[PDB]
From a paper:
Both proteins fold into a canonical α/β hydrolase architecture and superpose with a root-mean-square deviation (RMSD) of atomic positions of 1.54 Å over 210 amino acid residues.
The crystal structure of ZmB6T1C9 reveals exactly such architecture with a continuous tunnel stretching through the entire protein, allowing for insertion of long fatty acids and their hydrolysis by the catalytic triad of the enzyme. We determined Michaelis–Menten parameters for hydrolysis of a series of p-nitrophenyl esters and found stronger affinities for longer fatty acid chains with pNP palmitate binding almost 200 times stronger to the protein compared to pNP acetate. We therefore conclude that the phylogenetic clade containing ZmB6T1C9 represents canonical acyl-protein thioesterases (APTs). This indicated that in AtSOBER1 all protein parts retained a similar rigidity, whereas in APT1 and ZmB6T1C9/ZmAPT2 the loop had a higher flexibility than the rest of the protein.
Numbering used by the authors: 19 to 249
Write the structure that this text describes.
Amino acid sequence: YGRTHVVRPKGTHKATIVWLHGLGDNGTSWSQLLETLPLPNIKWICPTAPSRPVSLFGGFPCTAWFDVADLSEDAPDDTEGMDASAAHVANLLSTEPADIKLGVGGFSMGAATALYSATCFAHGKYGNGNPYPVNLSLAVGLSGWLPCARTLKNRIEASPEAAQRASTIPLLLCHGKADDVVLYKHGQRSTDALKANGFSNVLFKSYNSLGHYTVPEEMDEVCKWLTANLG
């Protein structure tokens, strides 16, 4: 794993959010955006993914939360890699006292790992079957997609308490229609896959001219949504 940058809460610490960067990026660059947001009371933990051989890049190593081969809709899910990063995020979040609210967010591949974490919390276990140890208050995905949508129904249907957790967890999906890295249709299908499987508190915000990056109008919606769903 890479080097982590932590943004100290400027006011009364009430929530801790682990924010996951995109492919080839690092946590420090995201820490410098998050610390400009009008969000006191939130501690930002920005880790950096391991520089991992990426099959999409012909095996070239770079920072990645999980391995990706192929860009098609049928591509393999690196469940082992996603569970490892989800368990890593969970370990980071397990450092707070019990009264601190816990969330996870990310951009692109980091958004995918954040959304996958939310489905592990709903399922109550990782993809390998180990129990999920942390109580997530929310998750945010910017310009990403939902991994392991194929198995989401079977995982949620494993328990009535899984469906209860899925129905209450607030999820924010943001995507730009001009995105040429992660196509906008993946944002719509991730929202549809979540809603179809019991996640009844999913908000999907679209921006028509937004590409594969962030804009202040998008981040302003993130701030308002985080303020409301964290109290």
